[PDB]
Amino acid sequence: STHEVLAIGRLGVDIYPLQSGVGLADVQSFGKYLGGSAANVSVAAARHGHNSALLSRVGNDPFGEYLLAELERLGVDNQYVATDQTFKTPVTFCEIFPPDDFPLYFYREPKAPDLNIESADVSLDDVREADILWFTLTGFSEEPSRGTHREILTTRANRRHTIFDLDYRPMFWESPEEATKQAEWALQHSTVAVGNKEECEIAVGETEPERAGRALLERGVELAIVKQGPKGVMAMTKDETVEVPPFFVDVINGLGAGDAFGGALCHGLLSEWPLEKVLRFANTAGALVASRLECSTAMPTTDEVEASLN
């Protein structure tokens, strides 16, 4: 029981509005879906036909039971999602103001189950053997998950591919300095790094994309992916720098666009494709999720991404 993609990190219930363009005071009803970045990435990888697993936790409650069943329904192995005996399954609300404004309201207090992960919760054989290990900067925000991440990544030993989502949300950290310290350690144990401008700033102290990628490769990462929003997205190795323009769509809900990108990145890397094709494929996958109201339930299949790739 080795997996192609072993993702580690956030899992929770998204309670999102069923009317768009209204603030929470005007929302009349909300839906319910599986979410959390790491969980979304494990789903997106599964939708590309890969055998995918998530290391996370849920609470000992009906929302946690929901998420465990939904992961399996969406094609993700849930065997490393333990039930926490103390903390509640987190909920996240949002507002939906297209094209660019999707405010998030996290209820992850006082600690999310997903930040209570123990290396006991996972097979370290699978950690070593997995084709891809996917993890987040948020995973280093609190103990015991920080120490667990360090154990996992030490034993992982920078095997191809070990993918670091630079995932910076200031409200999850005591300070930017705290996040940078952890990101620096994690970069030295990663083969791929993915972040936007704020994220790359936190991780390597570089606002400009080309300097960002260079700073990331200096840590020993062999593929830097710098998301640029307006200017699109760049992929950099020691052998080549590739850039792709933004795939323009009618955005319904942009939340989790980057997780579908991350899942599609995993597929392109497992497929051994050229870097330009990986980045094109990943870039299109994220736009497809952004063009729908849903995320975890709406993750694009490989045929839907290949069709849209023009």
Next chain:
Amino acid sequence: STHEVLAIGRLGVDIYPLQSGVGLADVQSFGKYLGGSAANVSVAAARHGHNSALLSRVGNDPFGEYLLAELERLGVDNQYVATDQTFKTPVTFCEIFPPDDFPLYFYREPKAPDLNIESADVSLDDVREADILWFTLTGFSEEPSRGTHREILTTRANRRHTIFDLDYRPMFWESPEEATKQAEWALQHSTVAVGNKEECEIAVGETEPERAGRALLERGVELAIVKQGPKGVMAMTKDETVEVPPFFVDVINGLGAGDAFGGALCHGLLSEWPLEKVLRFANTAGALVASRLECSTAMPTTDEVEASLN
């Protein structure tokens, strides 16, 4: 500005299912309502035409701003609902399994704004002069709310009517013994106590409604109201013992039925009705909320209760 009913305690957003008889895993959409027991009692009192106010707080977020606007839309003076600068507006979920099972899932972590109330948040003149002061045992569960309740109840000096809802939620306390200790002090500073069997057990160590009522009178209240479920309600004074049977209805969501009862009890006391009329009216009011999916928006008017009685 003196109110007829000054309620103190919890206030939150109810995120309740729009489908009944299904667990959270099978709920497809949720509504968004003002809720919290003291907030509900203030709304219920208002719907019987009484001038009512709530001492509580909200978080500095869109859900808190909603609750400020919803209180006022529902006819309750929000002047004593301050915006807490630290903690988030709480949300509560439930499952709706009639006739008898309405489990609650509170997100009140690490602290609810309502438990951060300070004596400076309220007019102490209104505390002293309001016809009815209504408070909950949950208000004693944490500081500074505990201290605030103490200061308030000391200055009120047991004037008619000072109403103690024995409101016992085990998860809000470190132990039942800590709840009992606070309930003994509150009972010495109250004129009316209202609770179900389990709440009377916590408060005075009696489960049988006649012994509980005598025990509550010995602690110093003038009127003990023991709710007995399908066997109705008992009211006891030093001169009088009265039992009223329930009002039969097809139950959808029993949540908030106690709160409708409380607002209706406020109306009966303010009207100086005989005890048996007060209980019948209050039982019917509770039964009508029990009949509906909604809680705060389903609090009945006096004419609606009258129509059900007649």
